[PDB]
């Protein structure tokens, strides 16, 4: 409900809105937030990989406040890259997790549909990282 | 350097508009606080966070400021507003109650608490808090701001009174009228006071005109006292026509003249209502009520002798002319000539500037509904519902499509008679009913729910 | 005989059947997850637009 509250306070006035629409949005917001108070569900605070800070960051968060190290997306399912396993193609160069491909059995790149084998591409990215 | 602050502000301003990053916007003031704390730094980060609409961090910063500044009633009201805007009503209410218990001599705090209590839909406590403080602060009459607070309290009391009215009651509530009259009197007094002090007064003038409009609508809704409304609306029109409000503000006069058009339509005077409609046309070319009333008056003048010819002539003269187009669509449905109807809708759409106009979309939905096609008609009716006008008709047509797809008699005596289809259609009808109860009328809503 | 088999093997959908999978979802999805919205006093139908 924290993200819902942020989205609702964003939605109340973007640039311009008729009075009836704004009143309806406020009615929806007050109904939702007076049925029960905003409760934060617990989750796993995985250790951060962007920097050396011991302050763990929430799984959903990608902003990485106070560090400035934003995380690259994974075009497979949207999860941020929190592991060494990430590769990309030479057509769209987007990070991609091995486990997501294995679960989804994706024969092509999710964005650009590059028709090249993912196993050899993982090997090539591993070689490139070894070069670095 | 004395211009260091301005330099940093400008550097910030070229760092959110050229590079488009909110994080750096926040960081610009974050470094200002972190480098050296002061008695105003938390206030300015709170202001920046409000400008970016991040209520929780601003509330935390204002809490730190209130830690630094002992009383600082400005930080008190800022904290109250921030905690009200964070969509956490329990802690905001607790803070309001604590502050009221501490110092019961803060009128702004009482007004904010009343607004929050109205928001949470707790009328009893809200009224029990509003009435004593508003009825007691009658000793500082010469002061301007105290008069403004009294006016706001009376307005919110009237709003509370009108909120607790179950639908279907047609008894003119006198206490609301008296409270609104006191509010307009105090607003006139404070307008005079603001004129005395050489301050901008047109905003008070326009808000008083809006309150006049609300009073006129309230008095027209229940008791048909046409002369009193006519006089009040003339006074309001004279009251919004000072300074440079002629050109800058146009929605106010639009609402006044729509209201006048509705009253003249009720009074059954074609000439005066036509003159008012001409005034609307000179004001706003995209007025829907003017076109609908003109179509109705033309129907009154001619029905079946040569109405089709003059309607086609008017369609030829004016490109869109949506109301006459809808009437012609109805006639062509009545005469099995939907092909020339399609030609006419294509011709009107070719020069419609914007495709998704409410009138054109409504006409397209009606034409597709009359052509034995429910899907596209439903889509167009849903698209055209996004307006003040045509909402009731579109919702009724959608409900009829959901309930009666083949356009047959509702109850067939030959066999069964009711028609039951799945479960989602009924829930969609319920959603349309919930929209109609706030947008459409009350009697049609009753018919549809029945 | 080979022409039909090869064409069916490849069959590049040019225009006609690029994405033709149109089935009413305004009613199909509303049965999937809208039940606790109607059960509670919540109106999010505006957001679903
Ligand atoms: Zn980190
Ligand atoms: Zn790619």
mmCIF file of N, CA and C in Angstrom, chain B residues 247-368:
data_model
loop_
_atom_site.group_PDB
_atom_site.id
_atom_site.type_symbol
_atom_site.label_atom_id
_atom_site.label_comp_id
_atom_site.label_asym_id
_atom_site.label_seq_id
_atom_site.Cartn_x
_atom_site.Cartn_y
_atom_site.Cartn_z
ATOM 1 N N UNK B 247 -12.323 38.906 -19.728
ATOM 2 C CA UNK B 247 -11.571 38.078 -20.663
ATOM 3 C C UNK B 247 -10.824 36.934 -19.993
ATOM 4 N N UNK B 248 -10.237 37.167 -18.817
ATOM 5 C CA UNK B 248 -9.437 36.131 -18.168
ATOM 6 C C UNK B 248 -10.303 34.951 -17.738
ATOM 7 N N UNK B 249 -11.390 35.225 -17.023
ATOM 8 C CA UNK B 249 -12.272 34.176 -16.525
ATOM 9 C C UNK B 249 -13.458 34.028 -17.470
ATOM 10 N N UNK B 250 -13.634 32.828 -18.015
ATOM 11 C CA UNK B 250 -14.731 32.558 -18.934
ATOM 12 C C UNK B 250 -15.583 31.368 -18.511
ATOM 13 N N UNK B 251 -15.061 30.445 -17.702
ATOM 14 C CA UNK B 251 -15.878 29.333 -17.242
ATOM 15 C C UNK B 251 -17.001 29.776 -16.324
ATOM 16 N N UNK B 252 -16.744 30.797 -15.504
ATOM 17 C CA UNK B 252 -17.768 31.307 -14.597
ATOM 18 C C UNK B 252 -18.993 31.786 -15.369
ATOM 19 N N UNK B 253 -18.782 32.671 -16.347
ATOM 20 C CA UNK B 253 -19.889 33.159 -17.160
ATOM 21 C C UNK B 253 -20.531 32.031 -17.952
ATOM 22 N N UNK B 254 -19.735 31.044 -18.369
ATOM 23 C CA UNK B 254 -20.284 29.884 -19.061
ATOM 24 C C UNK B 254 -21.289 29.147 -18.184
ATOM 25 N N UNK B 255 -20.928 28.900 -16.922
ATOM 26 C CA UNK B 255 -21.846 28.216 -16.017
ATOM 27 C C UNK B 255 -23.077 29.066 -15.724
ATOM 28 N N UNK B 256 -22.891 30.376 -15.533
ATOM 29 C CA UNK B 256 -24.038 31.257 -15.300
ATOM 30 C C UNK B 256 -25.010 31.186 -16.473
ATOM 31 N N UNK B 257 -24.484 31.246 -17.697
ATOM 32 C CA UNK B 257 -25.359 31.287 -18.860
ATOM 33 C C UNK B 257 -25.967 29.924 -19.166
ATOM 34 N N UNK B 258 -25.253 28.831 -18.881
ATOM 35 C CA UNK B 258 -25.888 27.518 -18.942
ATOM 36 C C UNK B 258 -27.049 27.443 -17.971
ATOM 37 N N UNK B 259 -26.837 27.926 -16.745
ATOM 38 C CA UNK B 259 -27.898 27.869 -15.754
ATOM 39 C C UNK B 259 -29.102 28.655 -16.245
ATOM 40 N N UNK B 260 -28.857 29.853 -16.790
ATOM 41 C CA UNK B 260 -29.922 30.658 -17.386
ATOM 42 C C UNK B 260 -30.632 29.927 -18.523
ATOM 43 N N UNK B 261 -29.882 29.216 -19.368
ATOM 44 C CA UNK B 261 -30.488 28.474 -20.471
ATOM 45 C C UNK B 261 -31.419 27.397 -19.932
ATOM 46 N N UNK B 262 -30.981 26.693 -18.886
ATOM 47 C CA UNK B 262 -31.830 25.669 -18.282
ATOM 48 C C UNK B 262 -33.099 26.280 -17.693
ATOM 49 N N UNK B 263 -32.977 27.424 -17.006
ATOM 50 C CA UNK B 263 -34.177 28.058 -16.453
ATOM 51 C C UNK B 263 -35.130 28.499 -17.554
ATOM 52 N N UNK B 264 -34.601 29.063 -18.642
ATOM 53 C CA UNK B 264 -35.475 29.510 -19.721
ATOM 54 C C UNK B 264 -36.130 28.328 -20.423
ATOM 55 N N UNK B 265 -35.410 27.210 -20.539
ATOM 56 C CA UNK B 265 -36.012 25.992 -21.071
ATOM 57 C C UNK B 265 -37.146 25.511 -20.176
ATOM 58 N N UNK B 266 -36.954 25.585 -18.857
ATOM 59 C CA UNK B 266 -38.025 25.216 -17.936
ATOM 60 C C UNK B 266 -39.218 26.158 -18.066
ATOM 61 N N UNK B 267 -38.963 27.452 -18.262
ATOM 62 C CA UNK B 267 -40.030 28.439 -18.366
ATOM 63 C C UNK B 267 -40.758 28.401 -19.704
ATOM 64 N N UNK B 268 -40.264 27.627 -20.672
ATOM 65 C CA UNK B 268 -40.898 27.463 -21.983
ATOM 66 C C UNK B 268 -41.001 28.800 -22.724
ATOM 67 N N UNK B 269 -39.838 29.403 -22.965
ATOM 68 C CA UNK B 269 -39.724 30.607 -23.786
ATOM 69 C C UNK B 269 -38.668 30.347 -24.851
ATOM 70 N N UNK B 270 -39.111 30.120 -26.089
ATOM 71 C CA UNK B 270 -38.175 29.756 -27.146
ATOM 72 C C UNK B 270 -37.290 30.932 -27.546
ATOM 73 N N UNK B 271 -37.840 32.149 -27.557
ATOM 74 C CA UNK B 271 -37.081 33.296 -28.048
ATOM 75 C C UNK B 271 -35.961 33.683 -27.084
ATOM 76 N N UNK B 272 -36.276 33.790 -25.791
ATOM 77 C CA UNK B 272 -35.256 34.168 -24.818
ATOM 78 C C UNK B 272 -34.193 33.084 -24.680
ATOM 79 N N UNK B 273 -34.613 31.818 -24.664
ATOM 80 C CA UNK B 273 -33.649 30.726 -24.592
ATOM 81 C C UNK B 273 -32.784 30.679 -25.845
ATOM 82 N N UNK B 274 -33.366 30.994 -27.005
ATOM 83 C CA UNK B 274 -32.585 31.056 -28.236
ATOM 84 C C UNK B 274 -31.572 32.194 -28.191
ATOM 85 N N UNK B 275 -31.961 33.343 -27.632
ATOM 86 C CA UNK B 275 -31.011 34.441 -27.473
ATOM 87 C C UNK B 275 -29.865 34.044 -26.550
ATOM 88 N N UNK B 276 -30.184 33.374 -25.442
ATOM 89 C CA UNK B 276 -29.134 32.904 -24.543
ATOM 90 C C UNK B 276 -28.233 31.884 -25.232
ATOM 91 N N UNK B 277 -28.816 31.003 -26.049
ATOM 92 C CA UNK B 277 -28.018 30.030 -26.791
ATOM 93 C C UNK B 277 -27.105 30.716 -27.799
ATOM 94 N N UNK B 278 -27.585 31.788 -28.433
ATOM 95 C CA UNK B 278 -26.720 32.578 -29.305
ATOM 96 C C UNK B 278 -25.575 33.197 -28.516
ATOM 97 N N UNK B 279 -25.858 33.651 -27.293
ATOM 98 C CA UNK B 279 -24.792 34.161 -26.435
ATOM 99 C C UNK B 279 -23.761 33.077 -26.131
ATOM 100 N N UNK B 280 -24.221 31.856 -25.834
ATOM 101 C CA UNK B 280 -23.284 30.753 -25.608
ATOM 102 C C UNK B 280 -22.455 30.470 -26.855
ATOM 103 N N UNK B 281 -23.097 30.475 -28.026
ATOM 104 C CA UNK B 281 -22.380 30.216 -29.271
ATOM 105 C C UNK B 281 -21.316 31.277 -29.519
ATOM 106 N N UNK B 282 -21.639 32.541 -29.237
ATOM 107 C CA UNK B 282 -20.629 33.592 -29.309
ATOM 108 C C UNK B 282 -19.534 33.380 -28.272
ATOM 109 N N UNK B 283 -19.869 32.762 -27.138
ATOM 110 C CA UNK B 283 -18.876 32.512 -26.098
ATOM 111 C C UNK B 283 -18.065 31.253 -26.391
ATOM 112 N N UNK B 284 -18.728 30.104 -26.462
ATOM 113 C CA UNK B 284 -18.054 28.821 -26.663
ATOM 114 C C UNK B 284 -18.629 28.098 -27.871
ATOM 115 N N UNK B 285 -17.856 27.905 -28.944
ATOM 116 C CA UNK B 285 -18.381 27.168 -30.106
ATOM 117 C C UNK B 285 -18.650 25.696 -29.833
ATOM 118 N N UNK B 286 -18.057 25.114 -28.792
ATOM 119 C CA UNK B 286 -18.167 23.683 -28.511
ATOM 120 C C UNK B 286 -19.133 23.395 -27.370
ATOM 121 N N UNK B 287 -20.233 24.138 -27.298
ATOM 122 C CA UNK B 287 -21.229 23.964 -26.249
ATOM 123 C C UNK B 287 -22.226 22.886 -26.661
ATOM 124 N N UNK B 288 -22.439 21.906 -25.782
ATOM 125 C CA UNK B 288 -23.352 20.811 -26.092
ATOM 126 C C UNK B 288 -24.791 21.158 -25.731
ATOM 127 N N UNK B 289 -24.993 21.814 -24.586
ATOM 128 C CA UNK B 289 -26.346 22.152 -24.162
ATOM 129 C C UNK B 289 -27.005 23.124 -25.132
ATOM 130 N N UNK B 290 -26.236 24.078 -25.663
ATOM 131 C CA UNK B 290 -26.793 25.009 -26.638
ATOM 132 C C UNK B 290 -27.286 24.279 -27.877
ATOM 133 N N UNK B 291 -26.486 23.343 -28.394
ATOM 134 C CA UNK B 291 -26.898 22.589 -29.573
ATOM 135 C C UNK B 291 -28.120 21.728 -29.278
ATOM 136 N N UNK B 292 -28.149 21.080 -28.111
ATOM 137 C CA UNK B 292 -29.297 20.249 -27.761
ATOM 138 C C UNK B 292 -30.568 21.083 -27.638
ATOM 139 N N UNK B 293 -30.477 22.245 -26.989
ATOM 140 C CA UNK B 293 -31.650 23.096 -26.827
ATOM 141 C C UNK B 293 -32.097 23.679 -28.161
ATOM 142 N N UNK B 294 -31.148 24.035 -29.030
ATOM 143 C CA UNK B 294 -31.508 24.518 -30.359
ATOM 144 C C UNK B 294 -32.213 23.432 -31.160
ATOM 145 N N UNK B 295 -31.725 22.192 -31.069
ATOM 146 C CA UNK B 295 -32.391 21.085 -31.745
ATOM 147 C C UNK B 295 -33.800 20.878 -31.205
ATOM 148 N N UNK B 296 -33.966 20.958 -29.882
ATOM 149 C CA UNK B 296 -35.293 20.793 -29.295
ATOM 150 C C UNK B 296 -36.239 21.907 -29.731
ATOM 151 N N UNK B 297 -35.749 23.148 -29.777
ATOM 152 C CA UNK B 297 -36.593 24.260 -30.209
ATOM 153 C C UNK B 297 -36.959 24.138 -31.683
ATOM 154 N N UNK B 298 -36.021 23.676 -32.513
ATOM 155 C CA UNK B 298 -36.324 23.461 -33.924
ATOM 156 C C UNK B 298 -37.347 22.345 -34.098
ATOM 157 N N UNK B 299 -37.248 21.299 -33.274
ATOM 158 C CA UNK B 299 -38.275 20.263 -33.247
ATOM 159 C C UNK B 299 -39.625 20.846 -32.845
ATOM 160 N N UNK B 300 -39.626 21.759 -31.873
ATOM 161 C CA UNK B 300 -40.864 22.415 -31.463
ATOM 162 C C UNK B 300 -41.470 23.217 -32.609
ATOM 163 N N UNK B 301 -40.636 23.941 -33.357
ATOM 164 C CA UNK B 301 -41.142 24.740 -34.469
ATOM 165 C C UNK B 301 -41.660 23.854 -35.597
ATOM 166 N N UNK B 302 -40.873 22.857 -36.001
ATOM 167 C CA UNK B 302 -41.262 21.930 -37.053
ATOM 168 C C UNK B 302 -40.961 20.503 -36.620
ATOM 169 N N UNK B 303 -41.922 19.608 -36.840
ATOM 170 C CA UNK B 303 -41.791 18.206 -36.464
ATOM 171 C C UNK B 303 -41.757 17.273 -37.664
ATOM 172 N N UNK B 304 -42.769 17.325 -38.531
ATOM 173 C CA UNK B 304 -42.878 16.358 -39.618
ATOM 174 C C UNK B 304 -43.188 16.958 -40.980
ATOM 175 N N UNK B 305 -43.551 18.239 -41.074
ATOM 176 C CA UNK B 305 -43.893 18.816 -42.372
ATOM 177 C C UNK B 305 -42.667 18.907 -43.273
ATOM 178 N N UNK B 306 -41.671 19.698 -42.866
ATOM 179 C CA UNK B 306 -40.428 19.820 -43.616
ATOM 180 C C UNK B 306 -39.226 19.887 -42.681
ATOM 181 N N UNK B 307 -39.318 19.234 -41.520
ATOM 182 C CA UNK B 307 -38.229 19.283 -40.550
ATOM 183 C C UNK B 307 -36.964 18.639 -41.101
ATOM 184 N N UNK B 308 -37.111 17.559 -41.871
ATOM 185 C CA UNK B 308 -35.944 16.860 -42.401
ATOM 186 C C UNK B 308 -35.151 17.768 -43.335
ATOM 187 N N UNK B 309 -35.845 18.535 -44.180
ATOM 188 C CA UNK B 309 -35.159 19.397 -45.139
ATOM 189 C C UNK B 309 -34.370 20.495 -44.434
ATOM 190 N N UNK B 310 -34.990 21.172 -43.463
ATOM 191 C CA UNK B 310 -34.287 22.235 -42.751
ATOM 192 C C UNK B 310 -33.152 21.674 -41.902
ATOM 193 N N UNK B 311 -33.340 20.480 -41.333
ATOM 194 C CA UNK B 311 -32.275 19.854 -40.558
ATOM 195 C C UNK B 311 -31.086 19.507 -41.446
ATOM 196 N N UNK B 312 -31.353 18.989 -42.649
ATOM 197 C CA UNK B 312 -30.277 18.714 -43.596
ATOM 198 C C UNK B 312 -29.590 20.001 -44.038
ATOM 199 N N UNK B 313 -30.363 21.073 -44.227
ATOM 200 C CA UNK B 313 -29.770 22.357 -44.590
ATOM 201 C C UNK B 313 -28.839 22.863 -43.495
ATOM 202 N N UNK B 314 -29.257 22.739 -42.234
ATOM 203 C CA UNK B 314 -28.413 23.175 -41.123
ATOM 204 C C UNK B 314 -27.173 22.296 -41.017
ATOM 205 N N UNK B 315 -27.322 20.993 -41.271
ATOM 206 C CA UNK B 315 -26.162 20.106 -41.286
ATOM 207 C C UNK B 315 -25.182 20.501 -42.384
ATOM 208 N N UNK B 316 -25.698 20.897 -43.548
ATOM 209 C CA UNK B 316 -24.828 21.354 -44.625
ATOM 210 C C UNK B 316 -24.131 22.658 -44.257
ATOM 211 N N UNK B 317 -24.842 23.566 -43.583
ATOM 212 C CA UNK B 317 -24.261 24.862 -43.244
ATOM 213 C C UNK B 317 -23.153 24.726 -42.205
ATOM 214 N N UNK B 318 -23.416 23.988 -41.115
ATOM 215 C CA UNK B 318 -22.434 23.862 -40.043
ATOM 216 C C UNK B 318 -21.813 22.475 -40.063
ATOM 217 N N UNK B 319 -20.479 22.364 -39.986
ATOM 218 C CA UNK B 319 -19.829 21.055 -40.151
ATOM 219 C C UNK B 319 -20.271 19.997 -39.151
ATOM 220 N N UNK B 320 -20.111 20.257 -37.851
ATOM 221 C CA UNK B 320 -20.381 19.213 -36.860
ATOM 222 C C UNK B 320 -21.871 19.112 -36.546
ATOM 223 N N UNK B 321 -22.429 20.150 -35.924
ATOM 224 C CA UNK B 321 -23.856 20.249 -35.599
ATOM 225 C C UNK B 321 -24.405 18.919 -35.076
ATOM 226 N N UNK B 322 -23.853 18.493 -33.936
ATOM 227 C CA UNK B 322 -24.010 17.111 -33.487
ATOM 228 C C UNK B 322 -25.448 16.762 -33.110
ATOM 229 N N UNK B 323 -26.183 17.680 -32.479
ATOM 230 C CA UNK B 323 -27.533 17.350 -32.040
ATOM 231 C C UNK B 323 -28.475 17.067 -33.196
ATOM 232 N N UNK B 324 -28.434 17.920 -34.223
ATOM 233 C CA UNK B 324 -29.255 17.692 -35.406
ATOM 234 C C UNK B 324 -28.814 16.414 -36.103
ATOM 235 N N UNK B 325 -27.512 16.121 -36.079
ATOM 236 C CA UNK B 325 -27.019 14.866 -36.638
ATOM 237 C C UNK B 325 -27.611 13.665 -35.910
ATOM 238 N N UNK B 326 -27.677 13.724 -34.578
ATOM 239 C CA UNK B 326 -28.262 12.624 -33.815
ATOM 240 C C UNK B 326 -29.747 12.470 -34.118
ATOM 241 N N UNK B 327 -30.467 13.591 -34.223
ATOM 242 C CA UNK B 327 -31.882 13.514 -34.577
ATOM 243 C C UNK B 327 -32.067 12.909 -35.965
ATOM 244 N N UNK B 328 -31.203 13.283 -36.910
ATOM 245 C CA UNK B 328 -31.274 12.725 -38.257
ATOM 246 C C UNK B 328 -30.952 11.235 -38.256
ATOM 247 N N UNK B 329 -30.011 10.811 -37.412
ATOM 248 C CA UNK B 329 -29.718 9.386 -37.275
ATOM 249 C C UNK B 329 -30.947 8.645 -36.763
ATOM 250 N N UNK B 330 -31.625 9.219 -35.766
ATOM 251 C CA UNK B 330 -32.849 8.605 -35.258
ATOM 252 C C UNK B 330 -33.912 8.510 -36.347
ATOM 253 N N UNK B 331 -34.080 9.578 -37.132
ATOM 254 C CA UNK B 331 -35.070 9.564 -38.205
ATOM 255 C C UNK B 331 -34.735 8.516 -39.261
ATOM 256 N N UNK B 332 -33.461 8.419 -39.645
ATOM 257 C CA UNK B 332 -33.061 7.445 -40.653
ATOM 258 C C UNK B 332 -33.207 6.018 -40.141
ATOM 259 N N UNK B 333 -32.994 5.799 -38.841
ATOM 260 C CA UNK B 333 -33.342 4.508 -38.254
ATOM 261 C C UNK B 333 -34.841 4.259 -38.354
ATOM 262 N N UNK B 334 -35.644 5.295 -38.104
ATOM 263 C CA UNK B 334 -37.093 5.184 -38.207
ATOM 264 C C UNK B 334 -37.574 4.954 -39.635
ATOM 265 N N UNK B 335 -36.751 5.244 -40.646
ATOM 266 C CA UNK B 335 -37.197 5.161 -42.034
ATOM 267 C C UNK B 335 -36.395 4.145 -42.846
ATOM 268 N N UNK B 336 -35.548 3.348 -42.187
ATOM 269 C CA UNK B 336 -34.703 2.360 -42.859
ATOM 270 C C UNK B 336 -33.906 3.026 -43.977
ATOM 271 N N UNK B 337 -33.092 4.018 -43.628
ATOM 272 C CA UNK B 337 -32.204 4.650 -44.594
ATOM 273 C C UNK B 337 -30.828 4.858 -43.976
ATOM 274 N N UNK B 338 -30.287 3.805 -43.359
ATOM 275 C CA UNK B 338 -29.047 3.928 -42.603
ATOM 276 C C UNK B 338 -27.832 4.146 -43.499
ATOM 277 N N UNK B 339 -27.943 3.879 -44.804
ATOM 278 C CA UNK B 339 -26.793 4.053 -45.688
ATOM 279 C C UNK B 339 -26.465 5.529 -45.899
ATOM 280 N N UNK B 340 -27.475 6.350 -46.195
ATOM 281 C CA UNK B 340 -27.222 7.784 -46.278
ATOM 282 C C UNK B 340 -26.848 8.350 -44.917
ATOM 283 N N UNK B 341 -27.314 7.719 -43.838
ATOM 284 C CA UNK B 341 -26.827 8.081 -42.512
ATOM 285 C C UNK B 341 -25.326 7.851 -42.402
ATOM 286 N N UNK B 342 -24.844 6.701 -42.885
ATOM 287 C CA UNK B 342 -23.411 6.425 -42.855
ATOM 288 C C UNK B 342 -22.643 7.438 -43.693
ATOM 289 N N UNK B 343 -23.174 7.777 -44.870
ATOM 290 C CA UNK B 343 -22.535 8.802 -45.692
ATOM 291 C C UNK B 343 -22.449 10.126 -44.942
ATOM 292 N N UNK B 344 -23.529 10.508 -44.257
ATOM 293 C CA UNK B 344 -23.541 11.770 -43.524
ATOM 294 C C UNK B 344 -22.550 11.759 -42.365
ATOM 295 N N UNK B 345 -22.459 10.644 -41.633
ATOM 296 C CA UNK B 345 -21.513 10.593 -40.518
ATOM 297 C C UNK B 345 -20.079 10.644 -41.030
ATOM 298 N N UNK B 346 -19.799 9.995 -42.166
ATOM 299 C CA UNK B 346 -18.459 10.099 -42.740
ATOM 300 C C UNK B 346 -18.153 11.532 -43.162
ATOM 301 N N UNK B 347 -19.121 12.199 -43.799
ATOM 302 C CA UNK B 347 -18.912 13.578 -44.229
ATOM 303 C C UNK B 347 -18.677 14.500 -43.039
ATOM 304 N N UNK B 348 -19.438 14.311 -41.957
ATOM 305 C CA UNK B 348 -19.258 15.139 -40.769
ATOM 306 C C UNK B 348 -17.942 14.837 -40.063
ATOM 307 N N UNK B 349 -17.498 13.579 -40.089
ATOM 308 C CA UNK B 349 -16.247 13.212 -39.436
ATOM 309 C C UNK B 349 -15.031 13.696 -40.212
ATOM 310 N N UNK B 350 -15.145 13.825 -41.538
ATOM 311 C CA UNK B 350 -13.995 14.249 -42.333
ATOM 312 C C UNK B 350 -13.506 15.637 -41.935
ATOM 313 N N UNK B 351 -14.399 16.498 -41.448
ATOM 314 C CA UNK B 351 -14.001 17.830 -41.006
ATOM 315 C C UNK B 351 -14.353 18.049 -39.540
ATOM 316 N N UNK B 352 -14.075 17.055 -38.696
ATOM 317 C CA UNK B 352 -14.399 17.116 -37.278
ATOM 318 C C UNK B 352 -13.213 17.529 -36.414
ATOM 319 N N UNK B 353 -12.077 17.869 -37.028
ATOM 320 C CA UNK B 353 -10.873 18.318 -36.328
ATOM 321 C C UNK B 353 -10.334 17.226 -35.410
ATOM 322 N N UNK B 354 -11.043 16.949 -34.320
ATOM 323 C CA UNK B 354 -10.679 15.895 -33.383
ATOM 324 C C UNK B 354 -11.691 14.764 -33.492
ATOM 325 N N UNK B 355 -11.190 13.541 -33.678
ATOM 326 C CA UNK B 355 -12.074 12.402 -33.906
ATOM 327 C C UNK B 355 -12.906 12.075 -32.671
ATOM 328 N N UNK B 356 -12.297 12.104 -31.491
ATOM 329 C CA UNK B 356 -12.957 11.638 -30.272
ATOM 330 C C UNK B 356 -13.659 12.788 -29.549
ATOM 331 N N UNK B 357 -14.518 13.486 -30.286
ATOM 332 C CA UNK B 357 -15.423 14.421 -29.641
ATOM 333 C C UNK B 357 -16.597 13.663 -29.025
ATOM 334 N N UNK B 358 -17.088 14.108 -27.863
ATOM 335 C CA UNK B 358 -18.186 13.372 -27.213
ATOM 336 C C UNK B 358 -19.431 13.244 -28.076
ATOM 337 N N UNK B 359 -19.823 14.313 -28.771
ATOM 338 C CA UNK B 359 -21.016 14.242 -29.601
ATOM 339 C C UNK B 359 -20.853 13.302 -30.780
ATOM 340 N N UNK B 360 -19.715 13.394 -31.472
ATOM 341 C CA UNK B 360 -19.476 12.523 -32.618
ATOM 342 C C UNK B 360 -19.366 11.066 -32.190
ATOM 343 N N UNK B 361 -18.675 10.802 -31.077
ATOM 344 C CA UNK B 361 -18.567 9.433 -30.583
ATOM 345 C C UNK B 361 -19.928 8.886 -30.169
ATOM 346 N N UNK B 362 -20.750 9.716 -29.522
ATOM 347 C CA UNK B 362 -22.093 9.285 -29.149
ATOM 348 C C UNK B 362 -22.933 8.971 -30.382
ATOM 349 N N UNK B 363 -22.839 9.812 -31.415
ATOM 350 C CA UNK B 363 -23.574 9.552 -32.649
ATOM 351 C C UNK B 363 -23.102 8.263 -33.313
ATOM 352 N N UNK B 364 -21.787 8.029 -33.329
ATOM 353 C CA UNK B 364 -21.258 6.797 -33.908
ATOM 354 C C UNK B 364 -21.747 5.575 -33.139
ATOM 355 N N UNK B 365 -21.745 5.655 -31.806
ATOM 356 C CA UNK B 365 -22.246 4.548 -31.009
ATOM 357 C C UNK B 365 -23.720 4.282 -31.244
ATOM 358 N N UNK B 366 -24.523 5.345 -31.339
ATOM 359 C CA UNK B 366 -25.945 5.174 -31.619
ATOM 360 C C UNK B 366 -26.168 4.548 -32.991
ATOM 361 N N UNK B 367 -25.420 5.007 -33.998
ATOM 362 C CA UNK B 367 -25.556 4.451 -35.341
ATOM 363 C C UNK B 367 -25.176 2.976 -35.371
ATOM 364 N N UNK B 368 -24.094 2.607 -34.681
ATOM 365 C CA UNK B 368 -23.685 1.207 -34.662
ATOM 366 C C UNK B 368 -24.654 0.348 -33.859
#
